[PDB]
Amino acid sequence: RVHEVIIFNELGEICAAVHMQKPQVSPCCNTHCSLRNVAKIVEQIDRAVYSIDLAIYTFTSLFLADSIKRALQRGVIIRIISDGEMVYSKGSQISMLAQLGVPVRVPITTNLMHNKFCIIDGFERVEEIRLLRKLKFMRPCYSIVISGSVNWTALGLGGNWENCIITADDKLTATFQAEFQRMWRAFAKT
C-alpha cells in the first residue's frame, strides 16, 4: 500500500522545459520534480470514495481545489478545518469550496491552526457515514493520510523546502482521523 515521503526542494523545477483535470505531468528524469509531487497528492484525492476531512492552514492551489471539486461531484463528503484568519483571506480556495456547500469550522483563538493533514476514507468516518445513511455494505476503500510541513500554496508546492508523508498506516490514519473528529465537535462554525 501507499507509504512514502514527498520531498519538495530547490531541484523541483530543473525539468521545467519538459513540462513547458490537472496537473497533467509528462514524464521527466527529475527525481525531485515538484509537478510529480503535486500529482501524487491529487491522485490520492482522486481515489477518495466516501470522505475527505481536511485540516489546513492555507490553501490557494487551483489544481488541488479542482481535485476536491471533482470529489464533491462524485459524492464524497468533504469537511474542512482551518485557521480563522486565513480561511477567507484573498486567494483562499476554502472560500470557493464553502460556496459549493462544503462545511468549514475554525477555532476561536489567538493561536494558529497549524495542524495540516488530509484524511481520506478514514475508517471511523466511513463507519459514521455508513450509519447516517443507514447502509449495511460499503464499496471497498481504505484510509490514507497526507500530512507534513506543506501548505497547498504557491510557495508550499513550488518554492519552499517542504515535505509530506502519504501513508495507509493504520495507526497514523486512525490518530489523525480521531483528532479531526475531536476538532470538528469543538470548533466554531463559519
* Site for a second copy, rule CB under 8 A: 3-5, 7-10, 55, 57, 107, 109, 111-117, 147-150, 155-156, 159-163, 165, 171-172, 175-176, 179, 182-183, 186
Q: Looking at beta carbons only, is 2 or 28 nearer to Zn ion?
A: 28
- Cβ distance 52 to 45 under 8 Å? yes
* 20/115 Cα distance (integer angstroms): 34
Identify whether 136 is a catalytic site residue.
no
Q: Looking at beta carbons only, is 50 or 57 nearer to a second copy?
A: 57
Q: Which of 116, 136, 169, 189 is catalytic?
A: 116
Residue 30 near which of a second copy, Zn ion, none (CB within 5-8 Å, type-dependent): Zn ion
Q: Which of 121, 134, 136, 189 is catalytic?
A: 121
Q: Looking at beta carbons only, is 29 or 132 nearer to a second copy?
A: 29
Binding site for Zn ion (CB under 5 A): 15, 28, 30, 33
Identify whether 121 is a catalytic site residue.
yes
* 22/76 Cα distance (integer angstroms): 19
Residue 113 near which of Zn ion, a second copy, none (CB within 5-8 Å, type-dependent): a second copy
Cell of 101: 456547500
**Given phi > 0 = left and psi -120 to 50 = alpha, else beta, which region is 69?**
alpha
Q: Which of 3, 22, 114, 170 is catalytic?
A: 114
Cell of 182: 475531536
Residue 163 near which of a second copy, Zn ion, none (CB within 5-8 Å, type-dependent): a second copy
- Cβ distance 44 to 146 under 8 Å? yes
* 153/157 Cα distance (integer angstroms): 6
Stated as kind and residue range, the H or E segment containing 56 is: none
Q: Looking at beta carbons only, is 15 or 71 nearer to a second copy?
A: 15
Cell of 9: 526542494
Return the active site residues. Answer: 114, 116, 121
